[model samples]
Target: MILVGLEAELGASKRGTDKGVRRLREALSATHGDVIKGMQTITQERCVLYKEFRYAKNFEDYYLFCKENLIPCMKEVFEKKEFPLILSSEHANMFGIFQAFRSVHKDKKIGILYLDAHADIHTAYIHGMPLGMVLNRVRRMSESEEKAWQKLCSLGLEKGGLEIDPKCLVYFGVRSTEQSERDVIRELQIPLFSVDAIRENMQEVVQKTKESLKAVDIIYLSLDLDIMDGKLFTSTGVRENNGLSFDELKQLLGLLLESFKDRLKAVEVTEYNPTVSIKHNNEEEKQVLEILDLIINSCKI
Candidate 1:
């Protein structure tokens, strides 16, 4: 059984995002029935959030939850560290999971399969003013967590003195990235595999990702629904005018989950707001449900 961490934080453009975990839980209950019962749920359906907040305003709040409550609970239930995926409200919280796990798996680096239309690798850390701020927030997210992670690494939580090799951060469907985010990519020289590039040369992208991920034991699968043709994820913080289709994304996820097997450590799908354009929310939710079903149904039994 997998330990599921359901978190809803203000990491988006809409208000209801703070309630996203509740909504996704509802989605799983309605769609999967009793199957979800076997899964363990982290407390409160969400942590306390920041009001009048920017994207990363309450960022550390999530880490507080994991440290105070979530981690010990998961350790009790699973006792074994195994999960098909752990879903959440935003991309920020991933820092903590990797930090925690690096303790047990010292020799492993996590390959991030970022499925999104936008390159979140932004330039500066500003929120609510311009679009580029969203990209910039990534710096803060990584930086804030990097402090603790670096400490952990000093204590030997991470192997080879590498918290996360930027190369291990791969993308399957990405486009519509802001200039600020692009600047981060160029500066950091982070490796990427966009939807267009994947379409043109999937093998090359995978080969590069493979070489980068050769030493990694697991993946940090972060799914931003905007990767789905913007029509589906139309309301996301960073929506691309053109992106991959629902079918293509589902197939890619399914194939990865099938092949990756034990390597799939955590999965977080974010950027769904009910009050947003109906076109995006409804379709995105359907895709999420479909993907969830596919994840559970087609598991490597």
Candidate 2:
């Protein structure tokens, strides 16, 4: 298994998240020593994509991170038929993953399982850089700002982003679904399954998610770690008071793994915050980071 971790925390706090990820690695090696052995049926590739970005965002840093280091690593893994999970805190960083995937798999379906309390599909680009649109649901920002956001909802009506169809991209574990995101889905005719919809009509909804992309060749799972019981991951930048719990995620992962076993390339967990989530200045960050490791380790199992 491959583990691609990105520690770019520009959209959120400026903590030493790379260190935290390393801390997680240490903790995992210590506790899961035996388990790690069993899980590693094959060799493992662990790359921290944002080792260059300690904190703060500059044009040069962003340019290098996106074009030079980040894209190359993502492209190499995809070429090798080995995609490791991207454990990250930065939301915009996911754009790096998708951007590289879109480039690598030019004619393939590049859908995202946007599992979060907020629809990160919002639109924003300061100085022509695409910011995480999903931030609107987090900072209480209005989705009506950029007239361009509407154009983003502009689906592949002609030709979509790489191979991903607007409809094939599915959403799960959405708690406080926003009106603007809802409108975007309606306007673009994109398929969506809210938390309530998931509960009330899972069989039909899950099938619809599958049906939407029956022709797709592969899928990219972009899971926000904060899409869990708030008490479990409130430190994340996009934390909401109410979101899907960890139990839900475990079940969803198991099901999705089974359903799309052959096609599943990578599964990512992001938005975990250890700063505020710590007990004495957030030692729980260590604990929570450990939990994050456990989840990634599970993928290996």
Candidate 3:
């Protein structure tokens, strides 16, 4: 598996996740050489962010630079038919990954399995809640905020847009939703699996996800660390009280990976804060490592 690390925390509201991937390397490099081998940093402008109040803290400039460089980097990885296992400071950067796939596979559609404790559908945190922007831009949906957003989404093309179908985008493990986000999801009719829904019946969640996305030939899996029980690990940007147990999440992830192995093109594990995590004497770090192991174990390639 090729490892692509993004060290910027501009998208997240939290202060410390910019260093999360770096600290992860520090903790895992000593003994996990096999996994750490051949790891690459796609950008050296580490921790570049200046927060703002109106739009996702540091989103404008952050989006500007990322769109300029990120698409090309991700396209190169995909053009080689190589799958990337990305380490991101925040979940919002998943937008770039989505665009990369769309650019590389213009004629093909991509499916997303968003496993997170939050809806990630708000326009407030444009960088933090990228799913909405990505959908709007890729679907070529006309909206109030098209100009600035299109600048990034277009990737400098004279006329390029992924135009991904919302039906193929599925959400799982979502909780702590805002009314605004709910409005967007409702408008799009996107399928979502809430925590309660998953807890009520895991198989339904797993099978329903597969059924919803079966048409797509490529899949992107984004795992947010906050999906785990906050009591078990709280080094995320926000802490949602009730969440999946480690065993439960592990089982679900294992099943999803097994079910989608053939079409799984890229995977990302995001939202880790070592500074906050270290408060528990590295418990969060250990949990992060365990999750990585699960991804490595379940991945087909």
Candidate 4:
């Protein structure tokens, strides 16, 4: 898998996530050269950030830029079969791939493995949410601001402006589900795997996730580092006390990979903000950085 950096942090409520990719690159520089000896490395080089906010936080404008860039870039990678292990400041970076698959493969369905602490199914680009929208969830929007977000989400996609099918969407490691997102999930009867449920029935959760996406033409894996317990991944902007341990996460990731195999189009791991690791000292930071690097390196497609 080629290491791809979306290098944007606008979706986050706080600062510092934008700086994560830079520091992570520095930490992996020595090994990156040798570790990725045969693989190609694609870097965005310049970070994508909305430097202005004339009104309420520049949320809409940021969404526009992110969707515009990601659609074409992700489409290109998909066509080339260069599965990217994406690292970004926030989860909105996943929108590009989300849009790309829908726009490019209009006739085929794309499955999503959304592993995160929070369900980022909000209509608008709230600081606490990812800039994403489901076409079927359009009825959920009533506000003018919500319409604008829907427009951004539908930009260059299908007539319905839908990017993913609820049937093909599965959530794991989701403990903090918002009411808005929850309502939609309940209405659609989307499969949700909470930490507790997974712990209680690992086999069932794994089997159900696989069965749901069995017919999908392609799979998109979205991994949020915040899905790990705070003690192991203190660098992410958001910390959830209830999360999968490293071993659990590793096993789950392995399961998904084995299930999807070559059908996995892209893998995006987000929200690792080294600058905001509250409990990390310099040494701890280094340790976390190395561990993250290795995890990412192993995900090479």
Q: Candidate 3, residues 147-245: lDDT per residue as tens digits?
A: 766666565333454576787888887777778788878888899987778778888888888888878878888898888777767788777778888
lDDT of 1 by residue, 1-301 (tens): 3425445333433444435545666666454434345743322232333223133465355435555554444334323544434554454444444444444555666677777666655423411221122122333346656674333223323233345666567766766556766766676577777777766765566668667777787876777767877665554555566677777777677666765666776666666545555573365566666777676565524
Look at candidate 3 and give me any clashing residue pairs. 52-57, 138-163
Model 3 — which ten-residue stretch has the worst lDDT?
A: 41-50
The TM-score ranking, best first, is 3, 4, 2, 1
Could you tell me the TM-score of candidate 1? 0.70
Residue pairs clashing, model 2: 2-84, 120-134, 122-133, 278-282, 279-282
**Steric overlap count per candidate:** 2, 5, 2, 2
Number of the predicted model whose TM-score against the real structure is largest: 3
Clashing pairs in 4: 1-300, 1-301
Q: List per-candidate RMSD values in Å.
A: 6.1, 6.5, 4.7, 4.1
Score each candidate by Cα lDDT: 0.54, 0.56, 0.69, 0.65
Which portions of model 1 miss their true places by more than 4 Å? 3-5, 8-14, 30-79, 123-162, 178-180, 201-204, 235-237, 280-282
User: Which scores higher on TM-score, 1 or 4?
Assistant: 4
Give a tens-digit lDDT track for model 4, residues 178-269. 67778877887788898887778777888998899888887878888777787677887778788987767767776777667767877776
Ranking by lDDT: 3, 4, 2, 1
